[PDB]
Amino acid sequence: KIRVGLIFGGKSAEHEVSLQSARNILDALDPQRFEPVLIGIDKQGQWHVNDPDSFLLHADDPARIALHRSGRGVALLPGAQQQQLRPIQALAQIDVVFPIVHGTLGEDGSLQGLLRMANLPFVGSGVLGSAVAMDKDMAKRVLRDARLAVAPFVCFDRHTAAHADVDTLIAQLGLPLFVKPANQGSSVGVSQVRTADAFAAALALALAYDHKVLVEAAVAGREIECAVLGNAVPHASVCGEVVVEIVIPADIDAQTQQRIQQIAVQAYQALGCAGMARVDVFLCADGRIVINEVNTLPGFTRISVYPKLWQASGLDYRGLITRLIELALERHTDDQLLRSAVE
Amino acid sequence: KIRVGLIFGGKSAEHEVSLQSARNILDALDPQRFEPVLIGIDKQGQWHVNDPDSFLLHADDPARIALHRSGRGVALLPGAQQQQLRPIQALAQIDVVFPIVHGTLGEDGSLQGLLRMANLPFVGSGVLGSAVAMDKDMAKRVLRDARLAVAPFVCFDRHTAAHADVDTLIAQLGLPLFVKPANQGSSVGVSQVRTADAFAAALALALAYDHKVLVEAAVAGREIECAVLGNAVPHASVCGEVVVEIVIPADIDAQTQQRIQQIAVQAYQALGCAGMARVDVFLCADGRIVINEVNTLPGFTRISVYPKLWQASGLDYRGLITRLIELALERHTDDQLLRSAVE
Ligand SMILES: Nc1ncnc2c1ncn2[C@@H]1O[C@H](COP(=O)(O)OP(=O)(O)OP(=O)(O)O)[C@@H](O)[C@H]1O
Ligand SMILES: Nc1ncnc2c1ncn2[C@@H]1O[C@H](COP(=O)(O)OP(=O)(O)OP(=O)(O)O)[C@@H](O)[C@H]1O
Ligand SMILES: [Mg+2]
């Protein structure tokens, strides 16, 4: 049996979603192959080891569900090769980590880097793919370069936002404008700017969340989401359409679904993603495909889109979780050897 | 006084260079402002706390210089806000980390992510800038997109290298071809392919070091290096020319030096670098400028190019180290507040 270190929670608006994801994953984990070890991260950034039967407060109340802050702290020994995760006051050897920490550090490559420094195999994108997908500015430029269509846009920081010319922006990108912080860690900060006079306040709110803010042209078209799974040979799920409230499978052509599937895969490859991502695209009347977002940490509750998309493609939740673990171990094994060359 | 956690060594061919860098930094650290704390990483990946007077074996012998493996281990408490770095068997509170770990994990964003997860301010690029610069494939695509010239090239993985057509490559990119692994962690793996028949062996050696291998067209022109310093408002040093053996200042025009300085800065900005980088460009007869590399972990010995370039620009070694620390704290303070918004 292999021990699966489920790390979840985080300083995030999505904190409760991560709680639910953890409970869902825990209940689907195949007991023939896996034993869980639970590490919860509270809303202050603090790590707590918990027992599976007692890691949640008010588990069955979605308005009150909270992390049991057991105060059982965690230590990581960088460069350790065994018992890398240690109790501050013993803990099962973890063999693979399934990180579902929502929030900037859980998503942006930082947590991934810590897991790398501890030599722990782990589920999902590695440092680069996470950092790159998470920064919507760098992601659009990378996508753009791989000749995938993304919304046209301009990016400002604090040092240049003070200089923004709304008329030139409206002349270039039109109206409405979508203003957003570059780090996709939160959905906070996103304003639809309908008139010229609303622009400055959008720009200033977004800059309280990140150092970079994208201002994008509106993309007119339907919203489609597509789940991707895999390392070197990624696979795409059937499509889900979001309505102006997700519909699975989306009401579109086999051939349209196929174009979107192919673009989701190329988008995934271009950013260097691994394990899993959800790709959200706009489908134009006419039907060009424009990528909105590649998300490297989808939801994993039973009501979440990413696993629903897989369910609708013939892949059960249990089976999805298992395959995410196997992918994490295959990547880890491959990386070992490469790390291994040197000196 | 602020405590400077110097972390150095690493599983790297450059291991001894990091040793020397550490000793140089230690001797220039301004004693009015800074106390050092030493953490050495041996060639196995293992962390050792040392005293400044005793961290090296054979310090004055460049052929024998080695890390004193004091076996004084280190623990990191993720999400800790104080005493984040802890002895396994006490250690001064670290206030800023100056990481000089050569090798894949020290350079590619992983170490940076661990430092982020420990909430430690640290010198040099953050997760994204390090990951992106380190992967020469993603870096060239990002550079390319920012309309900076890079050597034309094709990138293969294991899954596509088996399919490589040398004739189409020679038809597209010419001869010689430069074959290299994408991760710039090592200088190992770089072959100059002079005839068609040498190509397959280059490709196969490079693939033992990374999962991705660039094959580039030769760029005919002189090799120039330029040091960059700063966060939001980067500054460029005078230029150094490498000869077919560095010359400082380079023998080129004020105006050529200025074009190279500007391109180094734009390259630095495009990849999202912070603190420091060395930018290595080719200067064509004719004189277009093509970027070869952006390096986010330059050498820091007294004989290294990056500090020599700064010395030649009026910035003393002591003064350079101090400014790298201040930049690390300014970034950390700014990020704090942003992290701070949320929920
Ligand atoms: N350029 C655009 N054109 C048209 N609609 C847009 C654009 N940008 C965003 N939107 C709309 O706003 C929604 C939210 O934007 P986006 O998805 O980038 O931010 P987010 O932080 O990821 O929010 P969410 O968590 O809902 O995805 C999109 O689903 C879409 O409905
Ligand atoms: N496309 C190219 N055209 C011409 N010369 C090249 C090219 N690529 C590499 N070289 C030569 O080979 C040297 C080493 O290549 P590169 O610098 O990319 O690898 P590295 O691993 O960073 O090596 P180093 O540590 O010496 O920089 C370059 O300084 C240059 O002399
Ligand atoms: Mg979206």
Ligand SMILES: [Mg+2]
């Ligand atoms: Mg170079």
